[PDB]
Structure 1
Amino acid sequence: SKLPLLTENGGRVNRVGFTRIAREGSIHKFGFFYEFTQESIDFDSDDGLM
């Protein structure tokens, strides 16, 4: 019932349209740290601690 049938005379029949969609996404910030003293490095038993 919806086929776009034309005739010999043409004319403005069977007009169509279009649409589009919008997607989105966002970024976020992260991080962490740790502290130490010089003595915790120099006098520690393990020289590969850091």
Structure 2
Amino acid sequence: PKHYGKTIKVYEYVPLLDDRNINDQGIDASGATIVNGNLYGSSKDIGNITSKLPLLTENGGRVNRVGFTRIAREGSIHKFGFFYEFTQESIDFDSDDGLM
């Protein structure tokens, strides 16, 4: 719509387990703070999955935390044009009708 500049922005939402999800809200299963918010990224090693597995007892409090992240994109607009010029004597005295 008019009166909004020349650009458009949108939001993409990154999944929980993707590598792009980076933040400081992670808390490890032991309760100690951990650098990674997501449990494990796009990692298919069995060792990482085995080590970082959520675990709780019957009464559970403050064990495992996660976080989320979003990204944005953009687009823009340009303009083009061209023209041509003629004279009346050309169209009147041309041997070809319907040149226009």
Same fold by TM-score, threshold 0.5 exceeded? Answer: yes
CA displacement at 1:27 relative to structure 2 = 0.8
Aligned: 1:18 with 2:53: no
2-structure distance, mates of 1:6, 1:41: 90
Structure 1 runs, 4 residues or longer, greater than 2 Å off:
none
CA displacement at 1:26 relative to structure 2 = 0.8
1-structure distance, mates of 2:72, 2:80: 27
The TM-score, its normalising length taken from structure 1, stands at 0.80
Q: Quick check: which has more Rg, 1 or 2?
A: 1
1-structure distance, mates of 2:75, 2:99: 40
Name structure 2 gaps, 5 residues minimum.
1-50
1-structure distance, mates of 2:81, 2:58: 71
Name structure 1 gaps, 5 residues minimum.
none
CA displacement at 1:6 relative to structure 2 = 2.2
Q: Which has the higher contact order (CA 8 A, sep 6+)?
A: 2
* Sequence identity (%): 100
2-structure distance, mates of 1:46, 1:5: 89
Q: RMSD between aligned alpha carbons?
A: 1.2
| Deviations, residues 1-50 of structure 1 (Å, cap 9, x unaligned) | 11222221121221111111111111111100000111211211111211
